[PDB]
Scaffold this active site. Structure first.
Site, short mmCIF file in Angstrom:
data_model
loop_
_atom_site.label_atom_id
_atom_site.label_comp_id
_atom_site.label_asym_id
_atom_site.label_seq_id
_atom_site.Cartn_x
_atom_site.Cartn_y
_atom_site.Cartn_z
N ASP A 22 62.66 -53.39 61.01
CA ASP A 22 61.44 -53.35 61.79
C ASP A 22 61.48 -53.26 63.22
O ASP A 22 62.04 -54.31 63.79
CB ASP A 22 60.68 -54.74 61.21
N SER A 82 52.95 -42.36 75.29
CA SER A 82 52.60 -40.85 75.30
C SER A 82 51.72 -40.22 76.14
O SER A 82 50.96 -40.77 76.66
CB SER A 82 51.89 -40.82 73.68
#
Length: 330
Positions: free
Chosen positions: A35, A199
């Site tokens: 994770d 992004s």
């Protein structure tokens, strides 16, 4: 040193991935959920409340000659999905894919929430976010990666998750055979303890690319792609009959649909998520309503590039003094 381990989807939907991890001496092999959005290595154990264990493999510290109680240390964690676990702490030897760390904090669960109990395939979590998020008190502990770092050939790990197939976690090297083209690196903020990046934009299907900054985290422990409501609405508007269902808890679409791809930007590069990666199948067994793999982040407080996005790429988690993320097509 290096390590290399295969990671396997837990079910036909790629809801999560498990990676075998050796703990203790002699080795006890547990299948952990790696994770990159948390920083605790915790396991089902001989200490876990018996009614909360249903099919998991447990770690038994008393059978490990290298286990030592980390006296006074406790831990307690709550995840973004509302799940939780807590317990006490041992140090022990932990190996992943041939890479061994001695003195790793292994957080032994005394209690786990229902979602953990109900998932027999996951024996615990191995956190790979920054050690500033580790929940051990009163002495915070390091992740497996942070403990391994100084021994690694390069201070990196890579995630290469499969679509309906196994993939690979590598530690200490970049497998140049595992991706196509070049790797585009992008800056990381560690301010929230995550692999947080920005992004450069998105496209829906064959549509034009929209240049827009989307801050979010690279999180292998989250199944879906959670993005701003504007972006998500633009995606599902291209699917006839798709709608946001408050009863189901997100966007659903007709199972008869063909989904468009979704592209996200990494600097000037582009990662394309095929439409089939966004299909999470019937909302309930036999339903003709299917659950979408792109969902709004509006009720979370952060955008999450979860497995839907990451499995479309070869992802480099660069833990050098200045951390960075890299993405390549594959």
């Amino acid at each position: 040193s290096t390590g290399s381990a295969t990671t396997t989807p837990i079910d036909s939907l790629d809801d999560a991935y498990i990676t075998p991890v050796q703990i203790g001496t002699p080795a006890q092999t547990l299948n952990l959920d790696f994770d990159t959005g948390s920083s605790d290595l915790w396991v089902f154990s001989s200490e876990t409340t018996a009614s909360e264990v249903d099919g998991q493999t447990i770690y038994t510290p008393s059978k490990s000659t290298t286990a030592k109680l980390l006296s006074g240390a406790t831990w307690s964690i709550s995840y973004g999905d509302g799940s939780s676990s807590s317990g006490d702490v041992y140090t022990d030897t932990v190996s992943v894919g041939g890479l061994t760390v001695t003195g790793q904090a292994v957080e032994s669960a005394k209690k786990v929430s229902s979602s953990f109990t109900e998932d027999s395939t996951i024996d615990g979590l191995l956190g790979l976010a920054f050690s500033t998020l580790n929940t051990v008190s009163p002495t915070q502990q390091k992740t497996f990666f942070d403990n391994a770092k100084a021994s690694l050939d390069s201070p990196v790990f890579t995630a290469d998750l499969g679509y309906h197939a196994p993939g690979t976690y590598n530690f200490g090297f970049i497998d140049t055979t595992a991706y196509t083209g070049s790797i585009t690196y992008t800056a990381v903020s560690t301010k929230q303890g995550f692999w947080e990046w920005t992004s450069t934009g998105y496209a829906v299907g064959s549509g034009t690319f929209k240049s827009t900054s989307i801050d979010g985290i690279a999180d292998t422990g989250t199944t879906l792609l959670y993005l701003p409501a504007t972006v998500v609405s633009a995606y599902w508007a291209q699917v006839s009959g798709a709608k946001s269902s408050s009863s189901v808890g997100g966007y659903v679409f007709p199972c008869s649909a063909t989904l468009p791809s979704f592209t996200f930007g990494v600097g000037s590069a582009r990662i394309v998520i095929p439409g089939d990666y966004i299909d999470f199948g019937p909302i309930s067994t036999g339903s003709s309503s299917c659950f979408g793999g792109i969902q709004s982040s509006a009720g979370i407080g952060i955008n999450i590039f979860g497995d839907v996005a990451l499995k479309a790429a070869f992802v480099v988690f660069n833990g050098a003094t200045t951390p960075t993320l890299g993405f390549a097509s594959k």
